């Protein structure tokens, strides 16, 4: 059965941690990382999870299986985070969230309750976008499209393409945004271009879904939502998957959640139960732990408070590394003026590097991106900012 | 979008829980249970897990990602609990383990995999089984096709109308066996029937998949395996699917295993390569807290030896309710002869009851069973036993 079977690719993303770890260079520098690293290039658990574990273990009292929806608590929170309380939604009882294995869990079940029980047939991805979503979408045998967004030359969101691009998409497609913090880019729209993008949407028809899994990290928790909260108040269907890899740096516990909103209580009543149906059929029920946690600091007051401080602690010290990437990059004889790095938002950039640059990056100085110029701000340290600044210096 | 969107029907197994949470009157029983309840109704979480869970609280030091196939240590000791250490399939490296969100997670990738990557078209699947079956191969595209095996008139296993069944099965067909302890019948074959299944198997070509969702539930945990060990002797070719919620009573945390089992390491790692592809597009890398907990109890000796402790003490709790359920029916004055019940393994039993009569004892009596006649011994204790029988009795 498995003699013909061909060997898969190399995912673009995981397939370089493979090739740093074989590295023994001592040098190293490591910036297609996915995920947050810290002063000291660690990647702690917070504070807030710590003590949320210990009051678990010292309160759970059976490992019963939790319901293919999940924890009812950690639904509401999600929603609460998503819509704010003055939310429509909440009190139409238009929403029902399901917790999922993370963000990409989500995305999957989206996927697959789309393409089941829905006439979608395409989706409409960014050019660039993170890698993995051609292959969730694809997996459920749904075409990916993709519609211009970033513009090589200025650095910036190229909004008239962008607009230009989705003009061929039609009603009934699916419209993927990035909730905040787009991945891998850094460039999300303004207030107003979102504005813009919710009301051309409505017009043409469009299904949107927004992958959310860096809230909290560009201006703050409420602040990145108003993208989401801008489409919500003129849409009457939508879909966003949400993770909580990220923003509570609980990665390994796959935490996330798929939110529907449909018209009325009646309908997304009917339509969320094809969606658990759909996660019966492939991992049954969510993983406890990560999304208990979870539930139990967003609904102590005390948890919260130190959760948002180790969050905005987290963003503050990524802003700090975009500016030093700057100032470095500077001093250390750019020609190249890398100001834009400042203006993008989250962990990514697209450093306006060529493949030849970064392999070259690689093999010469020991500096790993992603082949896509997409490197991770928070992979960067006042100690190695130097090192990091003058190779990318001697290859431009 | 969501206008149109029939609701999807009742899950045969997790809709009665709604009925029964519903059904206001006292007296209620539920036997249509899928988990373990101990003497006095409860489902705790081990002794042995609590103080791996402490263990991890005081020494994990990040939650980063964990790499699609997961933790190494518990792949390595599902291997060895499947397997054996004496076992070849280890030595050549010829086996891989990738950790899933639960049973029903590793069923699933394995059914993505075998859907993409290989011309399988077919399983089958006993009749009956596990309702969920169906629907995660329906789920991939894969058509289901039943198997005899149960004997409605002895209680039996149907041997002849098995084989007689399966001969319809070609060469390239999947075929899906349970370990032991069957879902829902409690008929498993024996250690002879067994060895005559694998040389039957490997003569016909068929690929056989292994739910194996109860080791140690049985007899004991090699006993429990002998009828997977007689078949990975003979076959080149091989897929497992375990599951840990049910003998760690890890229910909500999602731990479970797909083992891919191949010719030679260096098909087996070019075969597998595809299934970590699968899981990428899936839930992307698996929830570390419930393996972790497995690992580590698995790995130490002493913590190995009270979980052990726990789980024989659930086994023959349940042998012991098998016992009294028989002796009570007898005392209460049942006509027919439930031996066959102390015959079967495992916490399920085909009371051999019509869907009128299982019908008649829910809203008569107050008695929850599946609409199969699957019921769970483990839902009985010393207190409620007389009850239940005597609704039983009064129904017959
Ligand atoms: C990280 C990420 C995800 C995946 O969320 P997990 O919680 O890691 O599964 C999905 N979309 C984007 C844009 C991401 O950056
Ligand atoms: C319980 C069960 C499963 C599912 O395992 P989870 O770990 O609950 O997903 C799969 N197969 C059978 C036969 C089962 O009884």
Same mark, same amino acid.
């Given at each position: 059965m498995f003699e013909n079977i061909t060997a898969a690719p190399a995912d673009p993303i995981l397939g370089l941690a493979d090739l740093f770890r074989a590295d023994?260079?001592?040098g190293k520098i490591n910036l297609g990382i996915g995920f947050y690293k810290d002063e000291t290039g660690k990647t702690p658990v917070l504070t807030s999870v710590k003590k949320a574990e210990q009051y678990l273990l010292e309160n759970e009292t059976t490992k019963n299986y939790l319901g293919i929806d999940g924890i009812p608590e950690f639904g509401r929170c999600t929603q609460e985070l998503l819509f704010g309380k003055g939310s429509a939604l909440i009190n139409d009882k238009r929403a029902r969230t399901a917790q999922t294995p993370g963000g990409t869990g989500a995305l999957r079940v989206a996927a697959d309750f789309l393409a089941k029980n829905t006439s979608v047939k395409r989706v409409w991805v960014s050019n660039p976008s993170w890698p993995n979503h051609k292959s969730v979408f694809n997996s459920a045998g749904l075409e990916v499209r993709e519609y211009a967004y970033y513009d /090589?030359?200025? &650095?910036? $969101?190229?909004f008239d393409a962008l607009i230009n691009s989705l003009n061929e998409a039609q009603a009934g497609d699916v419209v993927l945004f990035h909730?905040?913090? &787009?991945?891998?880019?850094?460039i999300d729209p303004t207030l107003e271009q979102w504005q813009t993008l919710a009301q051309l949407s409505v017009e043409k028809g469009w299904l949107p879904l927004f992958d959310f899994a860096?809230?909290?990290? /560009?201006?703050g928790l409420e602040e990145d939502a108003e993208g989401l909260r801008a489409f919500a108040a003129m849409h009457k269907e939508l879909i966003v998957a949400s993770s909580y890899s990220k923003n509570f740096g609980l990665?390994?516990?796959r935490v996330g959640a798929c939110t529907l909103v449909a018209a009325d209580s009646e309908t997304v009543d009917r339509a969320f139960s094809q969606m658990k149906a759909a996660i019966r059929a492939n991992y049954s029920n969510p993983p406890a732990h990560g999304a208990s946690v979870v539930a139990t600091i967003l609904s102590n007051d005390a948890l919260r408070a130190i959760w948002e401080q180790e969050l905005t602690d987290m963003r503050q010290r990524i802003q700090r590394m975009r500016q030093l990437f700057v100032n470095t990059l500077q001093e250390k004889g750019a020609n190249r003026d890398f100001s834009f790095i400042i203006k993008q938002n989250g962990?990514?950039?697209?450093?306006? $590097?060529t493949k030849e640059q970064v392999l070259r990056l690689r093999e010469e100085f020991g500096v790993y991106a992603v082949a896509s110029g997409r490197v991770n701000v928070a992979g960067m340290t006042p100690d190695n900012m130097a090192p990091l600044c003058e190779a990318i210096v001697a290859v431009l």
């Open positions: 023994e260079r001592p /090589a030359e200025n &650095h910036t $969101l190229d909730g905040c913090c &787009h991945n891998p880019t850094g860096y809230q909290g990290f /560009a201006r990665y390994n516990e962990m990514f950039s697209f450093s306006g $590097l």
